[PDB]
Short mmCIF file of C-alpha atoms and ligand atoms in Angstrom, two decimals:
data_model
loop_
_atom_site.label_atom_id
_atom_site.label_comp_id
_atom_site.label_asym_id
_atom_site.label_seq_id
_atom_site.Cartn_x
_atom_site.Cartn_y
_atom_site.Cartn_z
CA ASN A 1 0.00 0.00 0.00
CA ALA A 2 0.85 3.74 -0.43
CA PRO A 3 2.51 5.94 2.31
CA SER A 4 -0.16 7.10 4.79
CA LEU A 5 -1.21 10.72 5.20
CA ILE A 6 0.62 10.70 8.55
CA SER A 7 3.83 9.58 6.87
CA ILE A 8 3.55 12.58 4.58
CA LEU A 9 2.45 14.85 7.40
CA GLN A 10 5.45 13.98 9.52
CA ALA A 11 7.54 14.72 6.50
CA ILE A 12 6.08 18.14 5.60
CA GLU A 13 6.02 19.35 9.14
CA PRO A 14 7.70 22.74 9.23
CA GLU A 15 10.78 23.30 11.33
CA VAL A 16 10.61 25.65 14.25
CA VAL A 17 10.96 29.29 13.43
CA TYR A 18 13.16 31.54 15.55
CA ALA A 19 11.78 35.02 16.24
CA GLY A 20 15.08 36.94 16.01
CA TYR A 21 14.14 38.42 19.37
CA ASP A 22 16.40 40.21 21.81
CA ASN A 23 15.75 38.85 25.29
CA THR A 24 18.04 41.40 26.92
CA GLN A 25 15.81 44.27 25.82
CA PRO A 26 13.03 44.87 28.43
CA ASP A 27 9.47 43.49 28.15
CA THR A 28 7.38 46.23 26.63
CA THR A 29 3.96 45.44 25.26
CA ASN A 30 4.88 47.23 22.00
CA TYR A 31 8.21 45.41 21.59
CA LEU A 32 6.60 42.07 22.44
CA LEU A 33 3.68 42.43 20.03
CA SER A 34 5.87 43.81 17.24
CA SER A 35 8.18 40.86 17.72
CA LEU A 36 5.25 38.42 17.71
CA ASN A 37 4.15 39.80 14.38
CA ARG A 38 7.56 39.51 12.86
CA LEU A 39 7.30 35.87 13.83
CA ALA A 40 3.80 35.52 12.42
CA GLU A 41 5.25 36.64 9.13
CA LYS A 42 8.05 34.07 9.41
CA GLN A 43 5.46 31.44 10.23
CA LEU A 44 2.98 32.47 7.56
CA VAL A 45 5.61 31.64 4.97
CA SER A 46 6.28 28.20 6.50
CA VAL A 47 2.52 27.61 6.90
CA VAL A 48 1.64 28.34 3.25
CA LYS A 49 4.55 26.29 2.02
CA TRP A 50 3.24 23.62 4.43
CA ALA A 51 -0.27 23.77 2.99
CA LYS A 52 0.95 23.46 -0.59
CA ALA A 53 2.68 20.16 0.39
CA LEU A 54 -0.49 19.02 2.16
CA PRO A 55 -2.00 16.06 0.19
CA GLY A 56 -5.06 17.06 -1.83
CA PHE A 57 -4.73 20.76 -0.99
CA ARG A 58 -3.17 21.70 -4.36
CA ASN A 59 -6.23 19.97 -5.93
CA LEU A 60 -8.55 22.65 -4.54
CA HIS A 61 -9.25 25.74 -6.62
CA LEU A 62 -6.77 28.53 -5.89
CA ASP A 63 -9.72 30.62 -4.67
CA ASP A 64 -10.38 28.01 -1.96
CA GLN A 65 -6.70 27.52 -1.24
CA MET A 66 -6.19 31.20 -0.45
CA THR A 67 -9.50 31.58 1.39
CA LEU A 68 -8.95 28.59 3.74
CA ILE A 69 -5.44 29.84 4.41
CA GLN A 70 -6.83 33.32 4.95
CA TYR A 71 -9.28 32.00 7.58
CA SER A 72 -7.33 29.22 9.29
CA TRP A 73 -3.85 30.84 9.54
CA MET A 74 -4.54 32.16 13.03
CA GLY A 75 -5.78 28.85 14.44
CA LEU A 76 -2.94 27.00 12.77
CA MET A 77 -0.34 29.18 14.42
CA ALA A 78 -2.02 29.17 17.85
CA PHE A 79 -2.47 25.42 17.75
CA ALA A 80 1.10 24.68 16.68
CA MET A 81 2.05 27.02 19.49
CA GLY A 82 -0.21 25.09 21.89
CA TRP A 83 1.61 22.01 20.74
CA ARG A 84 5.11 23.46 21.15
CA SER A 85 4.29 24.94 24.57
CA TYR A 86 3.27 21.42 25.62
CA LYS A 87 6.35 19.60 24.35
CA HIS A 88 8.88 22.19 25.44
CA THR A 89 7.52 23.64 28.68
CA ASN A 90 4.71 21.26 29.43
CA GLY A 91 2.06 23.96 29.25
CA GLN A 92 3.60 26.29 31.81
CA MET A 93 4.97 28.81 29.32
CA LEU A 94 3.93 30.04 25.93
CA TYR A 95 6.52 28.88 23.47
CA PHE A 96 6.15 31.19 20.53
CA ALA A 97 9.71 30.26 19.51
CA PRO A 98 12.95 29.10 21.23
CA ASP A 99 14.10 32.76 21.50
CA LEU A 100 10.71 34.17 22.43
CA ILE A 101 9.04 32.22 25.26
CA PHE A 102 6.38 33.97 27.35
CA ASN A 103 6.26 33.44 31.09
CA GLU A 104 4.00 35.20 33.61
CA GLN A 105 5.72 38.59 33.40
CA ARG A 106 5.43 38.75 29.64
CA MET A 107 1.89 37.47 29.42
CA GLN A 108 1.05 40.39 31.65
CA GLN A 109 3.25 42.80 29.71
CA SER A 110 1.48 41.59 26.53
CA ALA A 111 -1.84 43.38 27.07
CA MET A 112 -3.43 40.17 25.73
CA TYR A 113 -3.20 38.44 29.13
CA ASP A 114 -6.65 36.80 28.99
CA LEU A 115 -5.79 35.41 25.57
CA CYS A 116 -2.40 34.10 26.63
CA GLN A 117 -4.34 32.34 29.37
CA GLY A 118 -6.68 30.85 26.76
CA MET A 119 -3.82 29.64 24.57
CA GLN A 120 -2.39 28.14 27.71
CA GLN A 121 -5.59 26.30 28.57
CA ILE A 122 -5.12 24.87 25.08
CA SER A 123 -1.64 23.63 25.79
CA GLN A 124 -2.80 22.45 29.23
CA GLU A 125 -5.37 20.31 27.40
CA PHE A 126 -2.68 18.97 25.13
CA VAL A 127 -1.01 18.08 28.41
CA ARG A 128 -4.12 16.68 30.11
CA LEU A 129 -4.89 14.56 27.05
CA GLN A 130 -1.28 13.54 26.42
CA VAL A 131 -1.79 14.27 22.71
CA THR A 132 0.61 12.43 20.37
CA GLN A 133 2.43 13.71 17.28
CA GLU A 134 0.21 11.82 14.90
CA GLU A 135 -2.99 13.00 16.52
CA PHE A 136 -1.54 16.52 16.42
CA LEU A 137 -0.53 16.44 12.76
CA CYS A 138 -3.98 15.26 11.68
CA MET A 139 -5.73 17.68 14.02
CA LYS A 140 -3.75 20.57 12.63
CA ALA A 141 -4.52 19.32 9.14
CA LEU A 142 -8.23 19.31 10.00
CA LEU A 143 -7.88 22.71 11.63
CA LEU A 144 -7.08 24.18 8.25
CA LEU A 145 -10.13 22.42 6.81
CA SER A 146 -12.39 23.69 9.63
CA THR A 147 -13.31 27.29 8.68
CA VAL A 148 -15.00 27.55 5.28
CA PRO A 149 -16.69 30.52 3.51
CA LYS A 150 -20.48 30.35 4.06
CA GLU A 151 -21.24 30.95 0.39
CA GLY A 152 -19.71 27.47 -0.28
CA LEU A 153 -16.48 26.52 -2.12
CA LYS A 154 -15.48 26.21 -5.79
CA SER A 155 -14.03 22.75 -5.08
CA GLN A 156 -16.74 21.78 -2.48
CA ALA A 157 -16.89 18.01 -3.21
CA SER A 158 -13.13 17.56 -3.32
CA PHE A 159 -12.86 19.42 0.03
CA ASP A 160 -15.52 17.33 1.75
CA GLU A 161 -13.50 14.32 0.62
CA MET A 162 -10.25 15.76 1.98
CA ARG A 163 -12.00 16.53 5.30
CA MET A 164 -13.31 12.96 5.24
CA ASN A 165 -9.77 11.63 4.70
CA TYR A 166 -8.27 13.66 7.53
CA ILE A 167 -10.98 12.51 9.88
CA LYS A 168 -10.14 8.97 8.62
CA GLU A 169 -6.47 9.43 9.35
CA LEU A 170 -7.19 11.05 12.69
CA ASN A 171 -9.04 7.82 13.24
CA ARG A 172 -6.11 5.64 12.12
CA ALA A 173 -3.97 7.62 14.62
CA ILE A 174 -6.27 7.29 17.65
CA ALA A 175 -6.67 3.59 16.80
CA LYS A 176 -2.92 3.04 17.29
CA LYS A 177 -2.42 2.37 21.07
CA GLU A 178 -5.22 -0.30 21.00
CA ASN A 179 -8.00 0.40 23.57
CA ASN A 180 -10.83 -0.77 21.34
CA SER A 181 -14.11 0.97 20.61
CA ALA A 182 -15.12 2.93 23.69
CA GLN A 183 -11.76 4.41 24.61
CA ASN A 184 -11.19 5.44 21.02
CA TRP A 185 -14.58 7.02 21.07
CA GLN A 186 -13.89 9.24 24.09
CA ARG A 187 -10.56 10.08 22.49
CA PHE A 188 -11.98 11.09 19.14
CA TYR A 189 -14.46 13.11 21.17
CA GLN A 190 -11.85 14.85 23.28
CA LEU A 191 -9.56 15.65 20.40
CA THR A 192 -12.29 16.96 18.09
CA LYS A 193 -13.66 18.80 21.09
CA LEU A 194 -10.22 20.35 21.49
CA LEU A 195 -10.30 21.23 17.79
CA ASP A 196 -13.76 22.76 18.12
CA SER A 197 -12.71 24.85 21.12
CA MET A 198 -10.08 26.32 18.83
CA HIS A 199 -12.55 28.59 17.02
CA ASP A 200 -13.57 30.13 20.32
CA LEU A 201 -10.03 31.21 21.01
CA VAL A 202 -9.23 32.20 17.45
CA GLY A 203 -12.27 34.47 17.83
CA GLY A 204 -10.68 36.50 20.64
CA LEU A 205 -7.40 36.34 18.79
CA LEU A 206 -8.61 37.69 15.47
CA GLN A 207 -10.62 40.30 17.38
CA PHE A 208 -7.53 41.57 19.28
CA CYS A 209 -5.56 41.11 16.06
CA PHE A 210 -7.71 43.46 14.01
CA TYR A 211 -7.96 45.80 16.96
CA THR A 212 -4.20 46.00 17.21
CA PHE A 213 -4.08 46.33 13.43
CA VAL A 214 -6.33 49.33 12.90
CA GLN A 215 -4.80 51.07 15.98
CA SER A 216 -1.26 50.11 15.03
CA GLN A 217 0.31 53.59 14.79
CA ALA A 218 -1.78 54.59 17.83
CA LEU A 219 -0.29 51.63 19.77
CA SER A 220 3.22 51.62 18.15
CA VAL A 221 2.95 47.92 17.16
CA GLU A 222 4.88 47.11 13.99
CA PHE A 223 3.04 44.70 11.64
CA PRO A 224 5.36 43.56 8.84
CA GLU A 225 4.50 43.54 5.12
CA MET A 226 3.14 40.00 4.35
CA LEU A 227 1.28 40.38 7.61
CA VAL A 228 -0.22 43.68 6.35
CA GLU A 229 -1.31 41.86 3.18
CA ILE A 230 -2.94 38.81 4.79
CA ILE A 231 -4.67 40.47 7.78
CA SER A 232 -6.00 43.09 5.42
CA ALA A 233 -7.44 40.62 2.89
CA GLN A 234 -8.86 38.52 5.72
CA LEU A 235 -10.43 41.37 7.73
CA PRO A 236 -13.40 42.35 5.56
CA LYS A 237 -14.47 38.73 4.78
CA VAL A 238 -14.28 37.90 8.48
CA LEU A 239 -16.39 40.85 9.62
CA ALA A 240 -18.84 40.19 6.77
CA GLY A 241 -19.38 36.80 8.46
CA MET A 242 -18.11 35.06 5.31
CA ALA A 243 -16.10 32.57 7.40
CA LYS A 244 -18.05 29.70 9.04
CA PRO A 245 -16.43 27.17 11.47
CA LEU A 246 -17.05 23.49 10.60
CA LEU A 247 -17.90 21.55 13.80
CA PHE A 248 -18.52 18.09 15.38
C1 CPS B 1 -20.65 44.01 14.37
C2 CPS B 1 -19.33 43.97 15.15
C3 CPS B 1 -18.83 42.52 15.36
C4 CPS B 1 -17.28 42.61 15.50
C5 CPS B 1 -16.98 44.12 15.42
C6 CPS B 1 -15.54 44.63 15.10
C7 CPS B 1 -14.43 44.10 16.02
O1 CPS B 1 -14.53 44.65 17.34
C8 CPS B 1 -13.03 44.43 15.50
C9 CPS B 1 -12.83 45.84 14.90
C10 CPS B 1 -11.81 46.56 15.78
C11 CPS B 1 -11.40 47.92 15.21
O2 CPS B 1 -10.74 48.65 16.24
C12 CPS B 1 -12.60 48.75 14.74
C13 CPS B 1 -13.93 48.12 15.13
C14 CPS B 1 -14.09 46.70 14.57
C15 CPS B 1 -14.16 46.77 13.06
C16 CPS B 1 -15.45 46.17 15.10
C17 CPS B 1 -16.67 46.89 14.45
C18 CPS B 1 -18.07 46.27 14.67
O3 CPS B 1 -18.56 46.76 15.92
C19 CPS B 1 -18.12 44.73 14.56
C20 CPS B 1 -18.02 44.36 13.07
C1 1CA B 2 -1.42 38.21 16.19
C2 1CA B 2 -0.80 38.17 17.61
C3 1CA B 2 0.72 38.19 17.52
C4 1CA B 2 1.21 36.92 16.80
C5 1CA B 2 0.70 35.60 17.43
C6 1CA B 2 -0.78 35.60 17.80
C7 1CA B 2 -1.03 34.48 18.79
C8 1CA B 2 -0.39 33.19 18.32
C9 1CA B 2 0.64 33.17 17.45
C10 1CA B 2 1.37 32.04 17.37
C11 1CA B 2 2.63 32.04 16.92
O1 1CA B 2 3.42 31.17 17.28
C12 1CA B 2 3.04 33.02 16.09
C13 1CA B 2 2.40 34.38 16.12
C14 1CA B 2 0.94 34.38 16.57
C15 1CA B 2 -0.02 34.36 15.36
C16 1CA B 2 -1.18 36.93 18.42
C17 1CA B 2 -2.65 37.09 18.74
C18 1CA B 2 -2.71 38.57 19.10
C19 1CA B 2 -1.42 39.20 18.57
C20 1CA B 2 -1.73 40.57 18.00
O2 1CA B 2 -2.84 40.88 17.56
C21 1CA B 2 -0.62 41.59 17.97
O3 1CA B 2 -0.24 41.71 16.60
#
């Protein structure tokens, strides 16, 4: 038989981005958030590259490709970050990158404190659930495929199939470990529930994101160029209520 989606997914998994951050410079809500954004630009590149590698994704109309990316990019980055914070700090600290890890001081200095907390609860779940790589890779894959424009998609049928497949491979991945039916079931539930709770958080995140974006010169937070492009193109569709979370 052919190499599984997970085999491919483990292969196309992006390397960890460094922020470029200076940790000697003091913790100032403007410096922090500017720095975060630089990173989001660094990640956005790795994410899109990632999505192009992602089996079936190239087979969607370019309209859909860019839209999905436009909607899911925030959740993708927050989730991967939930994952990293789990592996590297076991949920205690927010591990944006090896050179830019938030602790308590910096979550406070962030002026997003309640959102940090939320992202943390996400990593803490990763921890509670002892999520595995393979569950993670498939979850993240589904996370992309979990916020679609309400007016439908060019490639609709092909997408629904992809979604199907990534649920199927999330199933292959929970099934490893044995347990049989019932345990599996609760698992599937918990994971997908974790996925579904993602939208919630992304909500607050986009919200504060836009907020910070509009008021950028007001707040002295430096959004880089690719970041300008993407947030901008996302913003009006999002407000319009074009984007609709797919749930379980
Ligand atoms: C109807 C509600 C739901 C979400 C709301 C928006 C969000 O708050 C984010 C955004 C922050 C900026 O600062 C300027 C205000 C802006 C555009 C809000 C305007 C408006 O009230 C919206 C569309
Ligand atoms: C976009 C954002 C800065 C960048 C991060 C995001 C939260 C999660 C996140 C994960 C990453 O590992 C990279 C950057 C990023 C996407 C923040 C949510 C609010 C904050 C701002 O709105 C300030 O720009």
